[PDB]
Amino acid sequence: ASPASIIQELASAAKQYENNESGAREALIAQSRALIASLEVPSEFIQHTFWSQPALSAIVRLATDVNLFQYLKDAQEEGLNAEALASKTGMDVSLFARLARHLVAMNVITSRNGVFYGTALSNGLAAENYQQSIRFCHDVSRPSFGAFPSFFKGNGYKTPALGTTDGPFQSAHKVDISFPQWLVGNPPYLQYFNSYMSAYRAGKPNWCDNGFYPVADRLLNGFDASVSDVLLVDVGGGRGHDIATFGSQFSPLPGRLVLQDREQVINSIPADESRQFEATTHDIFTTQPVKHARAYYMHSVPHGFGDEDAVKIMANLVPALAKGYSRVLLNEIVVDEERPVMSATNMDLIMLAHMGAKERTEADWRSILTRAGLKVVNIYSYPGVAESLIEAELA
Amino acid sequence: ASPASIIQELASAAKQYENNESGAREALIAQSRALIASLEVPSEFIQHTFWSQPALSAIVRLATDVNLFQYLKDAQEEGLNAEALASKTGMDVSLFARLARHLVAMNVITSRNGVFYGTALSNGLAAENYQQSIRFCHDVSRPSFGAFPSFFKGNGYKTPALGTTDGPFQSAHKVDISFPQWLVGNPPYLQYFNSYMSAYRAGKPNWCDNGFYPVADRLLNGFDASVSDVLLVDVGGGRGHDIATFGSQFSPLPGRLVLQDREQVINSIPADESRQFEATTHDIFTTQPVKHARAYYMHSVPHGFGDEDAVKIMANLVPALAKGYSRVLLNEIVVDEERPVMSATNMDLIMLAHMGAKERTEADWRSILTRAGLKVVNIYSYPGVAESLIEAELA
Numbered sequence A, B: 001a002s003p004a005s006i007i008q009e010l011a012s013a014a015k016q017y018e019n020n021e022s023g024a025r026e027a028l029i030a031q032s033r034a035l036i037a038s039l040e041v042p043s044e045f046i047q048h049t050f051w052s053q054p055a056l057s058a059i060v061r062l063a064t065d066v067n068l069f070q071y072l073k074d075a076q077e078e079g080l081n082a083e084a085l086a087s088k089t090g091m092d093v094s095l096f097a098r099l100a101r102h103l104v105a106m107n108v109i110t111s112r113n114g115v116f117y118g119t120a121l122s123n124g125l126a127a128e129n130y131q132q133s134i135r136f137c138h139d140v141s142r143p144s145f146g147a148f149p150s151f152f153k154g155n156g157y158k159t160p161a162l163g164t165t166d167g168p169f170q171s172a173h174k175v176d177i178s179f180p181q182w183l184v185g186n187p188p189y190l191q192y193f194n195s196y197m198s199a200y201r202a203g204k205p206n207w208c209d210n211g212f213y214p215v216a217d218r219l220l221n222g223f224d225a226s227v228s229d230v231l232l233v234d235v236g237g238g239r240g241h242d243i244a245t246f247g248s249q250f251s252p253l254p255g256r257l258v259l260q261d262r263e264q265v266i267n268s269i270p271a272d273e274s275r276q277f278e279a280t281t282h283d284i285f286t287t288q289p290v291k292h293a294r295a296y297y298m299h300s301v302p303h304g305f306g307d308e309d310a311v312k313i314m315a316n317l318v319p320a321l322a323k324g325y326s327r328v329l330l331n332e333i334v335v336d337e338e339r340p341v342m343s344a345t346n347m348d349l350i351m352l353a354h355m356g357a358k359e360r361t362e363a364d365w366r367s368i369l370t371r372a373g374l375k376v377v378n379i380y381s382y383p384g385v386a387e388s389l390i391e392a393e394l395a
């Protein structure tokens, strides 16, 4: 596509974005990246990919060590000049201004008349969960990507056979243990990971939002407390950010909300008297203990496991399902391989770089659910959202 | 700026780009990046910065090990499917398709009906100098950026005092020697660097192009073979790509073209009977041996050196200058600190990450030239071009 036609497509998406159509924001972003790619000469592609972005990642990482985004957030509309910010961060003024000016050039913060100002982005990055996301990605994920060329050359350009212990993660970090075992052994990155799970897709429409999955019609309609008093179990739900969002959207709840994860995750949940869920320890590789709930929900859980393990994770729900009553709700990326998109290839390579795993096509998921004893009822998607919602049931 | 106003600015730049105005291509790219930044939520910024781009750098690096861009270039409009390309590259078909699909999603190659196709970008990246640029950046530059957070935390957030031996480069690569000494000791990266110098700003208007520096009026007009038969000396000109471009644009030449660089650079220049320059060894830290030439040109040379060394590099030209006749032409970035731009902060952080050096403001350069014994005549710039052209003369 020529730049001329992409300029037209971009103008068309801007109209849809002004009219507030679903997915138009993401489409406008996608047209902009296509436009850049159609105009950039290879030397500019080299500079952006290999200079601007590694420098940007490093400075953003450095920002979380010196409290930079928090200070700019506090300054609000007044901002701070380099001398004030260097003094607050304990940095050489000259060094600080050079790093800050790259953030300005990358559109992360703004600058006017020698004063630096926070932005919606940088103010958002000031939050603790984004701070820990940045540290995790730069300290843990980045070296694994850096190891891809040499790891795959050494392994003969093969897909990791075991996934767990024979991937680029193990080579980058010079261990022979799995990524989950590495996290348990390497504080503070396990708790950084748990904060990260509330940030990696934040601000995107959730499965239970309007026009995505019909929660009311499929779950609340026909809820039967005589079958079970449990409305929804979130299997592997982290610190509970997804299940809490569910409860706030469908209150008063007709039944209980049960969060299931690892003990170290459950024990890190901060106290809250307004909590609408019960936090419980469960191992996804044992049989589901909550029997006959109206819904079992998983989000980004079996995508981190090979086929044999994914089948076990789904099969372990089967003994708990009430026939004709219990829904299985799998919130995962469904890869369309004829239409590759960043949101799907991103997570795919993240799975390869940490778990040695992969994102799956619709035929892939159907095969896994069938081997588990489940059958697909319907698959729901939403424009601009990475994940689909697969509703399954007892085969 | 709201997205609405940026959409308007983008439409205005597209008109200027259609009318072929100078710098309009770069301006259109800049508006697109601003638009993306105004629409992206922080989770998408995290995914792009810390997932998409490190993965993209790694795959592009892997591509140079398996000859991928060259194969797609050879396939021309027919393209290749994953099975054909995996067979040619010696890669697992599944592994290859996942990596290739990320290149498609990042707009580096295209895909239709399961067939992958080269692009202007990927076909350009197939050239040997871009191949070696990619290896240099991923193997040498990338680790240095990755070391920024921990290096500056360890050094108290100070500008490298010596620059040469006390910077993030030394920490990333675990040496105590300077970057130039490291290159000499680490084949093949020195010759990769020399290929890289012909790629890092290729495709951009040169200083001697129309509407930039008036070569004809300032140099050719008034050329005097009785003063010297040398028209232009390129001091530190690499393998000669800049001086060869000069000769092809201003032929028949009234005087000689002299290239000066390190012996290992001169000795790597491939033979060419149509060569219009004389390749000669010279050390920029000794007095200029070519006396009274019409012009002495440097491009991206003193920007890699601290103030004391930059002064010496410029002062070493002074004994060779013919008063009233010899021009000094310094082709370097001139940083406008009130208006930060990617092309200037990019190179600034590259200087920090390799040389422990920095890009300079106009007042910075004037101070250096004055201490060297030179005075500025005029400074020329061009829309969208990173470097300016400072014409100096004997003070």
Ligand SMILES: C/C(=C\Cc1c(O)c(C)c2c(c1O)C(=O)OC2)CC/C=C(\C)CCC(=O)O
Binding pocket: A141, A179, A180, A181, A183, A184, A193, A200, A262, A264, A300, A301, A302, A303, A304, A305, A350, A351, A354, A355
């Ligand atoms: C499915 C898993 C990880 C797979 C994954 C993701 O699901 C998501 C969304 C992201 C990444 C990731 O690796 C990532 O890096 O960014 C986002 C399980 C990882 C295991 C534990 C933390 C348990 C440790 C214990 O034993 O207690």
Ligand SMILES: C/C(=C\Cc1c(O)c(C)c2c(c1O)C(=O)OC2)CC/C=C(\C)CCC(=O)O
Binding pocket: B141, B179, B180, B181, B183, B184, B193, B200, B262, B264, B300, B301, B302, B303, B304, B305, B350, B351, B354, B355
């Ligand atoms: C000014 C120097 C480097 C400074 C620099 C650049 O001028 C440019 C354009 C780039 C980088 C860079 O480091 C870079 O990384 O990307 C582009 C001199 C480096 C020394 C030698 C190669 C001599 C070795 C011997 O002794 O023979």
Ligand SMILES: Nc1ncnc2c1ncn2[C@@H]1O[C@H](CSCC[C@H](N)C(=O)O)[C@@H](O)[C@H]1O
Binding pocket: A197, A198, A236, A237, A238, A239, A242, A260, A261, A262, A265, A282, A283, A284, A285, A298, A299, A300, A301
């Ligand atoms: N064996 C196991 N038993 C229970 N939970 C597990 C588990 N292995 C991994 N998990 C959990 O699976 C989750 C995967 S990350 C996804 C978290 C959350 N559902 C979200 O999308 O935001 C983590 O919370 C992790 O602790």
Ligand SMILES: Nc1ncnc2c1ncn2[C@@H]1O[C@H](CSCC[C@H](N)C(=O)O)[C@@H](O)[C@H]1O
Binding pocket: B197, B198, B236, B237, B238, B239, B242, B260, B261, B262, B265, B282, B283, B284, B285, B298, B299, B300, B301
């Ligand atoms: N002491 C020295 N004497 C001569 N040349 C030197 C030198 N130190 C570094 N150089 C040269 O300075 C150049 C800097 S990189 C710039 C290369 C070229 N002018 C371009 O812009 O494309 C390299 O070619 C390097 O070999």
